[PDB]
Amino acid sequence: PADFNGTWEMLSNDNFEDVMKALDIDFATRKIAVHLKQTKVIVQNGDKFETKTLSTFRNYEVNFVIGEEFDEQTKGLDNRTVKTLVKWDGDKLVCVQKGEKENRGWKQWIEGDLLHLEIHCQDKVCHQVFKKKN
């Protein structure tokens, strides 16, 4: 479907603290992480994704293949073990992370040259927007 290949620098980050609080991240850490810029670096070969997040906050990778469930350690956030599975919803990526927290996952898609990421946990949702670098 879509082509996520590229380097994408964050434009905006809304309601990040709501999701971080839902993940039990401590307030001090939230206060640090809310004002930090992130870059996403993505290599996509068909259903194969290698993603790098880069910030002064946390650096982390997420590598997956569409429809292949994998065990994931969420180092960029709460450092929990979850079972992650990413699938297509048309041209959007929809990820379910099965573990201690209910209704956890994320959804990612492209509009023009912006990448949108929604991260959700429980009843909270964060919306991030990134601009393609080139």
mmCIF file of all heavy atoms in Angstrom, residues 3-52:
data_model
loop_
_atom_site.group_PDB
_atom_site.id
_atom_site.type_symbol
_atom_site.label_atom_id
_atom_site.label_comp_id
_atom_site.label_asym_id
_atom_site.label_seq_id
_atom_site.Cartn_x
_atom_site.Cartn_y
_atom_site.Cartn_z
ATOM 1 N N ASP A 3 4.059 3.997 1.018
ATOM 2 C CA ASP A 3 5.512 4.025 1.135
ATOM 3 C C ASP A 3 5.985 4.880 2.314
ATOM 4 O O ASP A 3 6.073 6.105 2.230
ATOM 5 C CB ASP A 3 6.173 4.521 -0.154
ATOM 6 C CG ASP A 3 7.660 4.215 -0.232
ATOM 7 O OD1 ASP A 3 8.313 4.040 0.820
ATOM 8 O OD2 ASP A 3 8.198 4.149 -1.361
ATOM 9 N N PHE A 4 6.313 4.219 3.424
ATOM 10 C CA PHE A 4 6.811 4.895 4.610
ATOM 11 C C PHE A 4 8.316 5.157 4.599
ATOM 12 O O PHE A 4 8.807 5.768 5.554
ATOM 13 C CB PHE A 4 6.457 4.070 5.866
ATOM 14 C CG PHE A 4 4.943 3.969 6.068
ATOM 15 C CD1 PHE A 4 4.178 3.065 5.358
ATOM 16 C CD2 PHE A 4 4.333 4.811 6.992
ATOM 17 C CE1 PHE A 4 2.792 2.994 5.541
ATOM 18 C CE2 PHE A 4 2.956 4.750 7.185
ATOM 19 C CZ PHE A 4 2.204 3.831 6.470
ATOM 20 N N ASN A 5 9.054 4.730 3.565
ATOM 21 C CA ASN A 5 10.495 4.966 3.538
ATOM 22 C C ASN A 5 10.823 6.446 3.744
ATOM 23 O O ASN A 5 10.217 7.281 3.069
ATOM 24 C CB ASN A 5 11.117 4.521 2.211
ATOM 25 C CG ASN A 5 11.390 3.028 2.200
ATOM 26 O OD1 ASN A 5 12.360 2.583 2.809
ATOM 27 N ND2 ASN A 5 10.507 2.287 1.528
ATOM 28 N N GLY A 6 11.760 6.722 4.645
ATOM 29 C CA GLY A 6 12.324 8.045 4.770
ATOM 30 C C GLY A 6 12.749 8.367 6.190
ATOM 31 O O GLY A 6 12.663 7.478 7.034
ATOM 32 N N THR A 7 13.168 9.604 6.373
ATOM 33 C CA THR A 7 13.470 10.251 7.635
ATOM 34 C C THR A 7 12.373 11.290 7.872
ATOM 35 O O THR A 7 12.085 12.078 6.979
ATOM 36 C CB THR A 7 14.822 10.978 7.666
ATOM 37 O OG1 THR A 7 15.884 10.022 7.545
ATOM 38 C CG2 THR A 7 15.040 11.670 8.995
ATOM 39 N N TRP A 8 11.776 11.238 9.052
ATOM 40 C CA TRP A 8 10.627 12.094 9.332
ATOM 41 C C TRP A 8 10.855 12.780 10.674
ATOM 42 O O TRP A 8 11.073 12.098 11.683
ATOM 43 C CB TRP A 8 9.332 11.289 9.379
ATOM 44 C CG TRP A 8 9.110 10.267 8.314
ATOM 45 C CD1 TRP A 8 9.697 9.035 8.168
ATOM 46 C CD2 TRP A 8 8.204 10.420 7.220
ATOM 47 N NE1 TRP A 8 9.201 8.411 7.041
ATOM 48 C CE2 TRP A 8 8.284 9.244 6.443
ATOM 49 C CE3 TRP A 8 7.333 11.447 6.833
ATOM 50 C CZ2 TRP A 8 7.520 9.062 5.287
ATOM 51 C CZ3 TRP A 8 6.584 11.253 5.693
ATOM 52 C CH2 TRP A 8 6.671 10.081 4.930
ATOM 53 N N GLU A 9 10.823 14.100 10.670
ATOM 54 C CA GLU A 9 11.096 14.862 11.877
ATOM 55 C C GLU A 9 9.797 15.404 12.444
ATOM 56 O O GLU A 9 8.883 15.872 11.762
ATOM 57 C CB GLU A 9 12.076 16.015 11.627
ATOM 58 C CG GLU A 9 13.167 15.654 10.640
ATOM 59 C CD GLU A 9 14.269 16.683 10.510
ATOM 60 O OE1 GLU A 9 15.234 16.637 11.312
ATOM 61 O OE2 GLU A 9 14.156 17.523 9.587
ATOM 62 N N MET A 10 9.751 15.319 13.775
ATOM 63 C CA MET A 10 8.463 15.610 14.409
ATOM 64 C C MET A 10 8.083 17.075 14.235
ATOM 65 O O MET A 10 8.942 17.943 14.413
ATOM 66 C CB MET A 10 8.536 15.201 15.883
ATOM 67 C CG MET A 10 7.554 15.888 16.820
ATOM 68 S SD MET A 10 7.743 15.229 18.518
ATOM 69 C CE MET A 10 7.004 13.622 18.204
ATOM 70 N N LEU A 11 6.823 17.312 13.884
ATOM 71 C CA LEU A 11 6.211 18.619 13.784
ATOM 72 C C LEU A 11 5.446 18.938 15.065
ATOM 73 O O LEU A 11 5.483 20.040 15.607
ATOM 74 C CB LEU A 11 5.218 18.688 12.627
ATOM 75 C CG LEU A 11 5.769 18.701 11.205
ATOM 76 C CD1 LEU A 11 4.678 19.141 10.239
ATOM 77 C CD2 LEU A 11 6.987 19.604 11.106
ATOM 78 N N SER A 12 4.713 17.920 15.533
ATOM 79 C CA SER A 12 3.804 18.150 16.651
ATOM 80 C C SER A 12 3.652 16.870 17.477
ATOM 81 O O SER A 12 3.860 15.792 16.926
ATOM 82 C CB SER A 12 2.443 18.597 16.136
ATOM 83 O OG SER A 12 1.837 17.600 15.305
ATOM 84 N N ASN A 13 3.285 17.028 18.739
ATOM 85 C CA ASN A 13 3.085 15.915 19.672
ATOM 86 C C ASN A 13 1.998 16.325 20.661
ATOM 87 O O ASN A 13 2.261 17.155 21.540
ATOM 88 C CB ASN A 13 4.409 15.601 20.347
ATOM 89 C CG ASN A 13 4.513 14.337 21.161
ATOM 90 O OD1 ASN A 13 3.651 13.454 21.138
ATOM 91 N ND2 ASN A 13 5.593 14.197 21.936
ATOM 92 N N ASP A 14 0.790 15.804 20.529
ATOM 93 C CA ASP A 14 -0.331 16.192 21.373
ATOM 94 C C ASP A 14 -0.786 15.028 22.257
ATOM 95 O O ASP A 14 -0.853 13.880 21.821
ATOM 96 C CB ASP A 14 -1.496 16.720 20.525
ATOM 97 C CG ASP A 14 -1.099 18.007 19.802
ATOM 98 O OD1 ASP A 14 -0.507 18.917 20.413
ATOM 99 O OD2 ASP A 14 -1.373 18.148 18.593
ATOM 100 N N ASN A 15 -1.061 15.326 23.518
ATOM 101 C CA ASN A 15 -1.566 14.353 24.477
ATOM 102 C C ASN A 15 -0.591 13.220 24.782
ATOM 103 O O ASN A 15 -1.025 12.139 25.192
ATOM 104 C CB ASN A 15 -2.904 13.810 23.935
ATOM 105 C CG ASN A 15 -3.979 14.867 24.072
ATOM 106 O OD1 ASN A 15 -4.635 14.963 25.117
ATOM 107 N ND2 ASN A 15 -4.166 15.666 23.033
ATOM 108 N N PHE A 16 0.702 13.477 24.602
ATOM 109 C CA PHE A 16 1.746 12.491 24.895
ATOM 110 C C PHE A 16 1.719 12.135 26.371
ATOM 111 O O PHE A 16 1.795 10.983 26.795
ATOM 112 C CB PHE A 16 3.097 13.075 24.485
ATOM 113 C CG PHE A 16 4.239 12.071 24.448
ATOM 114 C CD1 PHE A 16 4.084 10.810 23.916
ATOM 115 C CD2 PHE A 16 5.474 12.423 24.955
ATOM 116 C CE1 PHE A 16 5.146 9.915 23.891
ATOM 117 C CE2 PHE A 16 6.540 11.547 24.954
ATOM 118 C CZ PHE A 16 6.367 10.284 24.416
ATOM 119 N N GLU A 17 1.589 13.161 27.224
ATOM 120 C CA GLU A 17 1.571 12.894 28.654
ATOM 121 C C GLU A 17 0.393 12.045 29.098
ATOM 122 O O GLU A 17 0.549 11.260 30.034
ATOM 123 C CB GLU A 17 1.512 14.236 29.407
ATOM 124 C CG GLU A 17 2.713 15.117 29.075
ATOM 125 C CD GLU A 17 2.590 16.494 29.714
ATOM 126 O OE1 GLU A 17 2.940 16.581 30.912
ATOM 127 O OE2 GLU A 17 2.146 17.433 29.009
ATOM 128 N N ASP A 18 -0.759 12.190 28.448
ATOM 129 C CA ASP A 18 -1.888 11.324 28.807
ATOM 130 C C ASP A 18 -1.553 9.841 28.651
ATOM 131 O O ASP A 18 -1.849 9.016 29.509
ATOM 132 C CB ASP A 18 -3.112 11.577 27.912
ATOM 133 C CG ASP A 18 -3.820 12.872 28.212
ATOM 134 O OD1 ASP A 18 -3.644 13.413 29.316
ATOM 135 O OD2 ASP A 18 -4.574 13.347 27.337
ATOM 136 N N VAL A 19 -0.940 9.496 27.515
ATOM 137 C CA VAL A 19 -0.574 8.107 27.250
ATOM 138 C C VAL A 19 0.560 7.694 28.164
ATOM 139 O O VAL A 19 0.570 6.574 28.657
ATOM 140 C CB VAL A 19 -0.175 7.912 25.770
ATOM 141 C CG1 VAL A 19 0.369 6.523 25.498
ATOM 142 C CG2 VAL A 19 -1.386 8.194 24.891
ATOM 143 N N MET A 20 1.511 8.622 28.397
ATOM 144 C CA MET A 20 2.605 8.203 29.267
ATOM 145 C C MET A 20 2.082 7.913 30.672
ATOM 146 O O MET A 20 2.473 6.908 31.272
ATOM 147 C CB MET A 20 3.718 9.247 29.340
ATOM 148 C CG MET A 20 4.575 9.281 28.081
ATOM 149 S SD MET A 20 6.011 10.362 28.296
ATOM 150 C CE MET A 20 5.172 11.939 28.505
ATOM 151 N N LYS A 21 1.214 8.781 31.175
ATOM 152 C CA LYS A 21 0.576 8.505 32.479
ATOM 153 C C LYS A 21 -0.184 7.181 32.449
ATOM 154 O O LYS A 21 -0.099 6.387 33.386
ATOM 155 C CB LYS A 21 -0.333 9.674 32.863
ATOM 156 C CG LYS A 21 -0.969 9.581 34.245
ATOM 157 C CD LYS A 21 -1.896 10.759 34.514
ATOM 158 C CE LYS A 21 -2.667 10.580 35.815
ATOM 159 N NZ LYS A 21 -3.709 11.627 36.019
ATOM 160 N N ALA A 22 -0.954 6.876 31.396
ATOM 161 C CA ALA A 22 -1.620 5.577 31.270
ATOM 162 C C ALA A 22 -0.609 4.431 31.354
ATOM 163 O O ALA A 22 -0.955 3.346 31.828
ATOM 164 C CB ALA A 22 -2.410 5.494 29.968
ATOM 165 N N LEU A 23 0.643 4.608 30.937
ATOM 166 C CA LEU A 23 1.651 3.554 31.011
ATOM 167 C C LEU A 23 2.417 3.505 32.338
ATOM 168 O O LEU A 23 3.376 2.753 32.461
ATOM 169 C CB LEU A 23 2.664 3.751 29.863
ATOM 170 C CG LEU A 23 2.062 3.556 28.469
ATOM 171 C CD1 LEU A 23 3.005 4.044 27.375
ATOM 172 C CD2 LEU A 23 1.730 2.086 28.262
ATOM 173 N N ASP A 24 1.987 4.314 33.294
ATOM 174 C CA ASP A 24 2.616 4.440 34.601
ATOM 175 C C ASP A 24 4.017 5.030 34.515
ATOM 176 O O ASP A 24 4.871 4.764 35.375
ATOM 177 C CB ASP A 24 2.679 3.067 35.289
ATOM 178 C CG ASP A 24 1.359 2.334 35.233
ATOM 179 O OD1 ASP A 24 0.331 2.996 35.513
ATOM 180 O OD2 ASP A 24 1.334 1.126 34.931
ATOM 181 N N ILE A 25 4.314 5.833 33.491
ATOM 182 C CA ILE A 25 5.635 6.486 33.481
ATOM 183 C C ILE A 25 5.599 7.597 34.526
ATOM 184 O O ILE A 25 4.625 8.368 34.551
ATOM 185 C CB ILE A 25 5.984 6.956 32.072
ATOM 186 C CG1 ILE A 25 6.163 5.761 31.107
ATOM 187 C CG2 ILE A 25 7.220 7.831 32.003
ATOM 188 C CD1 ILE A 25 6.001 6.135 29.663
ATOM 189 N N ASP A 26 6.609 7.695 35.398
ATOM 190 C CA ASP A 26 6.582 8.722 36.447
ATOM 191 C C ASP A 26 6.592 10.159 35.957
ATOM 192 O O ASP A 26 7.150 10.540 34.928
ATOM 193 C CB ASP A 26 7.795 8.508 37.370
ATOM 194 C CG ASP A 26 9.126 8.954 36.786
ATOM 195 O OD1 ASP A 26 9.336 10.150 36.502
ATOM 196 O OD2 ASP A 26 10.009 8.081 36.631
ATOM 197 N N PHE A 27 5.968 11.055 36.729
ATOM 198 C CA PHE A 27 5.783 12.438 36.334
ATOM 199 C C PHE A 27 7.076 13.146 35.942
ATOM 200 O O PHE A 27 7.096 13.866 34.932
ATOM 201 C CB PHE A 27 5.057 13.201 37.467
ATOM 202 C CG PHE A 27 4.902 14.671 37.123
ATOM 203 C CD1 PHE A 27 4.303 15.063 35.936
ATOM 204 C CD2 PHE A 27 5.368 15.641 38.002
ATOM 205 C CE1 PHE A 27 4.197 16.405 35.602
ATOM 206 C CE2 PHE A 27 5.245 16.975 37.679
ATOM 207 C CZ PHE A 27 4.674 17.365 36.478
ATOM 208 N N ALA A 28 8.162 12.952 36.694
ATOM 209 C CA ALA A 28 9.455 13.526 36.343
ATOM 210 C C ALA A 28 9.874 13.140 34.922
ATOM 211 O O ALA A 28 10.262 14.003 34.136
ATOM 212 C CB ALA A 28 10.539 13.082 37.312
ATOM 213 N N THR A 29 9.746 11.850 34.613
ATOM 214 C CA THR A 29 10.090 11.365 33.271
ATOM 215 C C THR A 29 9.196 11.937 32.186
ATOM 216 O O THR A 29 9.685 12.399 31.142
ATOM 217 C CB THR A 29 10.043 9.823 33.231
ATOM 218 O OG1 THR A 29 11.072 9.292 34.088
ATOM 219 C CG2 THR A 29 10.299 9.331 31.820
ATOM 220 N N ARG A 30 7.894 11.957 32.390
ATOM 221 C CA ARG A 30 6.961 12.656 31.527
ATOM 222 C C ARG A 30 7.345 14.095 31.244
ATOM 223 O O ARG A 30 7.251 14.600 30.129
ATOM 224 C CB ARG A 30 5.572 12.703 32.196
ATOM 225 C CG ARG A 30 5.011 11.321 32.466
ATOM 226 C CD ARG A 30 3.513 11.327 32.460
ATOM 227 N NE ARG A 30 2.788 11.993 33.503
ATOM 228 C CZ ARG A 30 2.414 11.623 34.718
ATOM 229 N NH1 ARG A 30 2.693 10.450 35.267
ATOM 230 N NH2 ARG A 30 1.717 12.502 35.430
ATOM 231 N N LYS A 31 7.782 14.791 32.307
ATOM 232 C CA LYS A 31 8.092 16.212 32.115
ATOM 233 C C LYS A 31 9.316 16.382 31.224
ATOM 234 O O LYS A 31 9.385 17.364 30.476
ATOM 235 C CB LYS A 31 8.297 16.910 33.460
ATOM 236 C CG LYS A 31 7.512 18.206 33.593
ATOM 237 C CD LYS A 31 8.126 19.163 34.589
ATOM 238 C CE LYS A 31 9.056 20.184 33.938
ATOM 239 N NZ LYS A 31 8.805 21.551 34.460
ATOM 240 N N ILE A 32 10.235 15.431 31.306
ATOM 241 C CA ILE A 32 11.413 15.434 30.442
ATOM 242 C C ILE A 32 11.067 15.175 28.978
ATOM 243 O O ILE A 32 11.474 15.862 28.041
ATOM 244 C CB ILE A 32 12.405 14.338 30.884
ATOM 245 C CG1 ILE A 32 13.092 14.588 32.227
ATOM 246 C CG2 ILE A 32 13.431 14.101 29.779
ATOM 247 C CD1 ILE A 32 14.146 15.679 32.166
ATOM 248 N N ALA A 33 10.284 14.115 28.802
ATOM 249 C CA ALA A 33 9.973 13.551 27.499
ATOM 250 C C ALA A 33 8.980 14.390 26.725
ATOM 251 O O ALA A 33 8.944 14.356 25.490
ATOM 252 C CB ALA A 33 9.449 12.139 27.706
ATOM 253 N N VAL A 34 8.141 15.189 27.386
ATOM 254 C CA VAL A 34 7.153 15.909 26.588
ATOM 255 C C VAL A 34 7.747 16.992 25.709
ATOM 256 O O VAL A 34 7.211 17.349 24.648
ATOM 257 C CB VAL A 34 6.099 16.543 27.528
ATOM 258 C CG1 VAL A 34 6.803 17.582 28.391
ATOM 259 C CG2 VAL A 34 4.943 17.151 26.757
ATOM 260 N N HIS A 35 8.868 17.592 26.096
ATOM 261 C CA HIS A 35 9.376 18.705 25.304
ATOM 262 C C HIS A 35 10.490 18.303 24.353
ATOM 263 O O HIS A 35 11.262 19.150 23.899
ATOM 264 C CB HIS A 35 9.907 19.817 26.226
ATOM 265 C CG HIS A 35 8.750 20.584 26.794
ATOM 266 N ND1 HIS A 35 8.710 21.040 28.089
ATOM 267 C CD2 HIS A 35 7.584 20.949 26.208
ATOM 268 C CE1 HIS A 35 7.559 21.664 28.282
ATOM 269 N NE2 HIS A 35 6.860 21.626 27.158
ATOM 270 N N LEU A 36 10.601 17.017 24.057
ATOM 271 C CA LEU A 36 11.719 16.589 23.221
ATOM 272 C C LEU A 36 11.269 16.230 21.809
ATOM 273 O O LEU A 36 10.218 15.648 21.598
ATOM 274 C CB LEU A 36 12.439 15.402 23.879
ATOM 275 C CG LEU A 36 13.492 15.804 24.928
ATOM 276 C CD1 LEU A 36 12.860 16.695 26.002
ATOM 277 C CD2 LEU A 36 14.143 14.589 25.570
ATOM 278 N N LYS A 37 12.110 16.602 20.858
ATOM 279 C CA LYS A 37 11.896 16.325 19.453
ATOM 280 C C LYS A 37 12.279 14.875 19.181
ATOM 281 O O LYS A 37 13.163 14.340 19.835
ATOM 282 C CB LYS A 37 12.716 17.250 18.563
ATOM 283 C CG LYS A 37 12.554 18.728 18.895
ATOM 284 C CD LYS A 37 11.091 19.142 18.842
ATOM 285 C CE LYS A 37 10.954 20.658 18.880
ATOM 286 N NZ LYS A 37 12.181 21.342 18.361
ATOM 287 N N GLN A 38 11.601 14.273 18.227
ATOM 288 C CA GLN A 38 11.937 12.937 17.773
ATOM 289 C C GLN A 38 12.055 12.988 16.243
ATOM 290 O O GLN A 38 11.425 13.822 15.602
ATOM 291 C CB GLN A 38 10.907 11.871 18.124
ATOM 292 C CG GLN A 38 9.867 12.289 19.151
ATOM 293 C CD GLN A 38 8.895 11.154 19.427
ATOM 294 O OE1 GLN A 38 8.630 10.349 18.530
ATOM 295 N NE2 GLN A 38 8.380 11.092 20.653
ATOM 296 N N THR A 39 12.873 12.082 15.759
ATOM 297 C CA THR A 39 12.982 11.749 14.352
ATOM 298 C C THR A 39 12.660 10.273 14.190
ATOM 299 O O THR A 39 13.122 9.440 14.972
ATOM 300 C CB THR A 39 14.381 12.029 13.775
ATOM 301 O OG1 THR A 39 14.605 13.446 13.760
ATOM 302 C CG2 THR A 39 14.457 11.567 12.333
ATOM 303 N N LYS A 40 11.867 9.984 13.165
ATOM 304 C CA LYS A 40 11.633 8.576 12.866
ATOM 305 C C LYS A 40 12.442 8.242 11.615
ATOM 306 O O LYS A 40 12.327 8.994 10.641
ATOM 307 C CB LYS A 40 10.143 8.330 12.674
ATOM 308 C CG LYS A 40 9.405 7.582 13.756
ATOM 309 C CD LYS A 40 8.962 8.401 14.943
ATOM 310 C CE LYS A 40 7.961 7.670 15.823
ATOM 311 N NZ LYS A 40 8.576 6.908 16.950
ATOM 312 N N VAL A 41 13.229 7.174 11.616
ATOM 313 C CA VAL A 41 13.899 6.739 10.392
ATOM 314 C C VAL A 41 13.308 5.387 9.998
ATOM 315 O O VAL A 41 13.296 4.493 10.844
ATOM 316 C CB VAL A 41 15.423 6.622 10.542
ATOM 317 C CG1 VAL A 41 16.099 6.395 9.196
ATOM 318 C CG2 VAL A 41 15.968 7.870 11.220
ATOM 319 N N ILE A 42 12.804 5.266 8.782
ATOM 320 C CA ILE A 42 12.036 4.075 8.424
ATOM 321 C C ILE A 42 12.579 3.466 7.132
ATOM 322 O O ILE A 42 12.708 4.193 6.147
ATOM 323 C CB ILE A 42 10.540 4.380 8.231
ATOM 324 C CG1 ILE A 42 9.896 4.981 9.486
ATOM 325 C CG2 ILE A 42 9.777 3.147 7.783
ATOM 326 C CD1 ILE A 42 8.409 5.243 9.324
ATOM 327 N N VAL A 43 12.860 2.186 7.159
ATOM 328 C CA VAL A 43 13.161 1.426 5.953
ATOM 329 C C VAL A 43 12.075 0.379 5.731
ATOM 330 O O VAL A 43 11.884 -0.503 6.580
ATOM 331 C CB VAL A 43 14.535 0.751 6.069
ATOM 332 C CG1 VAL A 43 14.862 -0.030 4.808
ATOM 333 C CG2 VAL A 43 15.585 1.816 6.375
ATOM 334 N N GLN A 44 11.366 0.492 4.615
ATOM 335 C CA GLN A 44 10.261 -0.411 4.297
ATOM 336 C C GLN A 44 10.557 -1.155 3.000
ATOM 337 O O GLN A 44 10.764 -0.515 1.953
ATOM 338 C CB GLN A 44 8.928 0.341 4.139
ATOM 339 C CG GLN A 44 7.803 -0.514 3.558
ATOM 340 C CD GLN A 44 6.514 0.230 3.264
ATOM 341 O OE1 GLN A 44 6.426 1.460 3.361
ATOM 342 N NE2 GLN A 44 5.454 -0.469 2.878
ATOM 343 N N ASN A 45 10.551 -2.471 3.107
ATOM 344 C CA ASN A 45 10.599 -3.334 1.933
ATOM 345 C C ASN A 45 9.338 -4.187 1.891
ATOM 346 O O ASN A 45 9.331 -5.210 2.582
ATOM 347 C CB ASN A 45 11.845 -4.227 1.978
ATOM 348 C CG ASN A 45 13.126 -3.423 1.884
ATOM 349 O OD1 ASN A 45 13.496 -2.968 0.802
ATOM 350 N ND2 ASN A 45 13.813 -3.246 3.009
ATOM 351 N N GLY A 46 8.308 -3.803 1.142
ATOM 352 C CA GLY A 46 7.052 -4.535 1.145
ATOM 353 C C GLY A 46 6.449 -4.597 2.539
ATOM 354 O O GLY A 46 6.125 -3.561 3.131
ATOM 355 N N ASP A 47 6.275 -5.788 3.117
ATOM 356 C CA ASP A 47 5.670 -5.866 4.452
ATOM 357 C C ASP A 47 6.727 -5.893 5.550
ATOM 358 O O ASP A 47 6.418 -6.165 6.708
ATOM 359 C CB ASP A 47 4.794 -7.105 4.586
ATOM 360 C CG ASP A 47 3.436 -6.962 3.932
ATOM 361 O OD1 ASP A 47 3.115 -5.857 3.438
ATOM 362 O OD2 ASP A 47 2.691 -7.972 3.909
ATOM 363 N N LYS A 48 7.979 -5.630 5.192
ATOM 364 C CA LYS A 48 9.090 -5.658 6.126
ATOM 365 C C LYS A 48 9.500 -4.246 6.543
ATOM 366 O O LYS A 48 9.880 -3.424 5.706
ATOM 367 C CB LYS A 48 10.307 -6.370 5.500
ATOM 368 C CG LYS A 48 11.516 -6.267 6.412
ATOM 369 C CD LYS A 48 12.789 -6.729 5.716
ATOM 370 C CE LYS A 48 12.960 -8.232 5.802
ATOM 371 N NZ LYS A 48 14.390 -8.646 5.690
ATOM 372 N N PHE A 49 9.426 -3.962 7.838
ATOM 373 C CA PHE A 49 9.714 -2.638 8.353
ATOM 374 C C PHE A 49 10.839 -2.638 9.374
ATOM 375 O O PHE A 49 10.777 -3.405 10.325
ATOM 376 C CB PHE A 49 8.475 -2.045 9.052
ATOM 377 C CG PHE A 49 7.365 -1.616 8.104
ATOM 378 C CD1 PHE A 49 6.519 -2.566 7.547
ATOM 379 C CD2 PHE A 49 7.185 -0.280 7.802
ATOM 380 C CE1 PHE A 49 5.524 -2.150 6.668
ATOM 381 C CE2 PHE A 49 6.178 0.143 6.945
ATOM 382 C CZ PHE A 49 5.356 -0.804 6.370
ATOM 383 N N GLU A 50 11.800 -1.749 9.189
ATOM 384 C CA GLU A 50 12.852 -1.445 10.142
ATOM 385 C C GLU A 50 12.781 0.021 10.562
ATOM 386 O O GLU A 50 13.077 0.898 9.752
ATOM 387 C CB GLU A 50 14.230 -1.721 9.551
ATOM 388 C CG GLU A 50 14.459 -3.196 9.213
ATOM 389 C CD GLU A 50 15.550 -3.327 8.161
ATOM 390 O OE1 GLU A 50 16.656 -2.799 8.398
ATOM 391 O OE2 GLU A 50 15.303 -3.938 7.108
ATOM 392 N N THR A 51 12.368 0.255 11.802
ATOM 393 C CA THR A 51 12.124 1.646 12.181
ATOM 394 C C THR A 51 13.051 2.007 13.347
ATOM 395 O O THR A 51 13.240 1.182 14.229
ATOM 396 C CB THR A 51 10.689 1.958 12.607
ATOM 397 O OG1 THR A 51 10.429 1.292 13.863
ATOM 398 C CG2 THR A 51 9.627 1.450 11.646
ATOM 399 N N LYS A 52 13.552 3.217 13.256
ATOM 400 C CA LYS A 52 14.422 3.845 14.229
ATOM 401 C C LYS A 52 13.789 5.144 14.708
ATOM 402 O O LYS A 52 13.470 6.022 13.901
ATOM 403 C CB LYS A 52 15.766 4.153 13.595
ATOM 404 C CG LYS A 52 17.042 3.880 14.358
ATOM 405 C CD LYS A 52 18.160 3.559 13.365
ATOM 406 C CE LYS A 52 17.745 2.392 12.482
ATOM 407 N NZ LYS A 52 18.908 1.637 11.936
#
